[PDB]
């Protein structure tokens, strides 16, 4: 008048909730004579009405009725009659702890970038409970990992979340992945668990420039090397992971007189000719490159382009002469022409022989290296001979040997 | 025998170069009998064949005839007559600064990201020019800049080259461009100069995360708003560029109850909702929302949705009665029936005012707020009236009221 009972939810049907009849001041005998009932659209509850027992008459679900509320009361009217009356019932529903904690999903995926900081905070999914109470207090714990560990924080409420702490840095390019292991277990009685996984995917920073694999690419090629030609491949390594290791390669401090004459292909590095080389205008190359990847890292080597010699310029000769006279009764041994040969090749592609091809009444006198002397070596009579068209021929001592020819006309004079 | 002169580039036409004849033991006695002439291809000197003066016959440019050359040499043979002789001459030409540096481009770009520590070096591409020695020796100045400065380094050559270096942090969020000029400026005489830009372009790195506009978005509505409705908008601002500041909103620590009650669009933020509100069920949600970017920088606030009450909810009448039976000679004021009205709003809308609706020998006595006994007052016939429809009306106090009616059938026994 009125009474309120506790009972634990999820009792057997037929439980004894209290004797209302002896608990409102009833006498058993007068309990058909009143004929007491239960009313409430639930049917939760039921009076037997041979003693007057309030017993559970339906399964009771805390979790159902009350949800997440403190407090879970059940409020109904118990009437009597002759005299008809009512009779306020409450009837306190306690929780017990008949359900496990649960995480949205068994796998979670967490991306972070390995330029995170020793001590940074994620955040986790904290588990939910229908229980309520200490059936619902989580506590979470994580599996022991060298890189991840868990702080344990509580909102105004009392409630406890996770969050996740890294203690150790990550390297993207050491191990692309964690699996970690989460368990909330619950305060109730008997304790209640679950776990949930959670994949940690390294997100990939540009902490890596690009490495040449030499940090000099000499190459020896002949001048005669068509255009288009490869001549060698440069090679940088990047070991982070998408446009942070695209590589593009290019020339550096580059010239004219070699922007025309060599080209470096962006993607794949290779070297090639665009133009022709020529040994006896420049016998070496040495050009700067550079490697960049998406996030501007750089790398810088150098190219060194030997040329070796090719016998590919043929002996000159260069005559003079005294206006291509001679007089007949010159002495012996006159000085009648002169010979300058000169060969643009090196080495042996350049050393020159100058001979005379003929029987002429003259011969070649060598003066220095390159410097001969068409002298007089016989008669002369301009009735008999008035003109000799002396050849004089110079052959370098290449391989292939090349020659050139060069005739003049010295006229007898009287 | 031999004989080498030495003369400046770039010299006029008819300037002297030697005394050709006077140098090789030759006497202007005999100028004419000898007759002295150059032998060379190229047209660079003339002997004058009437004192026997070697002179500048044609343009001697040093850098077209050597180039980079150290040293400029060009050797001929000079040949008399009467007798025939060849006298090697060879004549040095000396550099003169008539060139300028040059920059390949009057404006360089360069890319370098806000990530970028105080003390990092940046390769600047050098300067070149066409001459030799210390006419080409660059010196290179940087002007004042307060977050770059230029230092200079030299190959293993003596040749300098520059480069620029960051003395200040770089903010793309506070100056994504900064305009630096460089000068070089040659040793030689007169000095020769040449300028170049660098646009430096501050690449963007992901240093913001998001901002949220409120660590709270409370707003209040009623239970029947309708299902798609817009209930709110949150917003985060993110200062970096691309990537790094597009915004992704989601739900966090969410249940069942509210996943499928609200949405929170991933773009635009926008809340909405999916279900019906039910002020009787729950009254306020409490939503944690997070905001990443594309580096996965994130941010976290907190939504609070509470629901006002609206009067939907009928009030209810149940009822009691000893099996619907009334003696005729009952004394006036005998319990009749029971009357228990509920209404499942709040406040007024579940206040409850319950009348009897029509002229009965009975009346309604109201017991406590929500309990009533229909008792008798007036006279009881069976043989004049058998039996009763007493009809129980009960009406909320809402805006706009509700009400129900429920009528009972009231035998009248002997
Ligand atoms: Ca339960
Ligand atoms: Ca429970
Ligand atoms: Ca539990
Ligand atoms: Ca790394
Ligand atoms: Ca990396
Ligand atoms: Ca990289
Ligand atoms: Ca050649
Ligand atoms: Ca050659
Ligand atoms: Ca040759
Ligand atoms: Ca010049
Ligand atoms: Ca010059
Ligand atoms: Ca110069
Ligand atoms: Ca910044
Ligand atoms: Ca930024
Ligand atoms: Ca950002
Ligand atoms: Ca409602
Ligand atoms: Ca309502
Ligand atoms: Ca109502
Ligand atoms: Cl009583
Ligand atoms: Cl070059
Ligand atoms: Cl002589
Ligand atoms: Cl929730
Ligand atoms: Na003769
Ligand atoms: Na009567």
Redesign the interface.
């Known amino acids: 008048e009125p009474i309120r009972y506790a009972i634990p939810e999820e009792l057997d049907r037929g439980s004894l909730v209290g004797n209302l009849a002896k608990d409102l001041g009833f006498g058993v005998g007068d309990l058909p004579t009143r004929n007491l009932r239960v009313?409430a659209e639930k049917k939760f509850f039921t009076v037997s009405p041979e003693n007057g027992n309030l017993l559970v008459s339906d399964r009771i679900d805390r979790e159902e009725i009350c949800g997440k509320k403190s407090t879970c009361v059940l409020e109904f009217?118990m009437?009597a009659?002759?005299?008809?009356?009512?009779f306020?019932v409450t009837v306190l529903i306690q929780d017990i702890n008949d359900n496990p904690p649960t995480f949205?999903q068994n796998i979670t995926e967490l991306?972070?970038?390995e330029l995170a900081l020793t001590g940074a905070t994620?955040?986790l999914?904290?588990a939910?409970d229908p229980d309520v109470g200490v059936n619902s207090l989580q506590q979470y714990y994580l599996s022991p990992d060298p890189h991840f560990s868990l702080i344990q924080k509580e909102n105004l409420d009392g409630s406890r979340?996770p969050e996740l702490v890294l203690k150790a840095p990550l390297d993207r390019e050491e191990q692309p992945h964690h699996h970690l292991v989460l368990t909330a277990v619950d305060g109730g009685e008997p304790s209640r668990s679950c776990t949930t996984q959670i994949r940690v995917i390294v997100?990939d920073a540009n902490d890596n420039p690009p490495v040449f694999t030499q940090d000099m690419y000499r190459v020896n090629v002949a001048e005669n090397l068509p255009a288009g030609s490869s001549v060698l491949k440069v090679m940088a390594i990047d070991m982070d992971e998408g446009i942070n290791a695209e590589i593009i390669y290019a020339f550096?401090?580059?010239?004219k007189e070699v922007r025309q004459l060599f080209k470096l292909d962006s993607k794949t590095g290779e070297l090639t000719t665009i133009g022709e080389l020529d040994f006896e205008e420049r016998d070496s190359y040495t050009i700067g490159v550079?490697a960049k990847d998406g996030?501007?890292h750089?790398a810088?080597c150098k190219v060194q382009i030997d040329i070796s010699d090719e016998n590919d310029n043929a002996p000159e000769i260069?005559l003079?002469?005294?206006s291509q006279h001679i007089q007949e009764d010159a002495e012996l041994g006159?000085?009648?022409?002169?010979i300058?040969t000169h060969d643009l090749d090196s080495g042996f592609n350049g050393e020159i022989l100058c001979q005379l091809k003929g029987n002429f009444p003259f011969k070649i006198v060598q003066?220095?290296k390159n410097?001969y002397?068409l002298v007089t070596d016989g008669a002369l009579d301009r009735e008999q001979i008035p003109e000799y068209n002396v050849t004089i021929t110079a052959t370098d001592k290449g391989n292939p040997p090349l020659s050139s020819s060069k005739t003049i006309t010295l006229h007898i004079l009287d």
């Open positions: 009313i009217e009437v009659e002759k005299p008809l009356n009512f306020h949205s991306e972070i970038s994620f955040a999914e904290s939910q979340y997100a550096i401090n580059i010239g550079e996030g501007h750089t810088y260069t003079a002469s005294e006159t000085a009648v022409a002169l300058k003066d220095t410097t002397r």
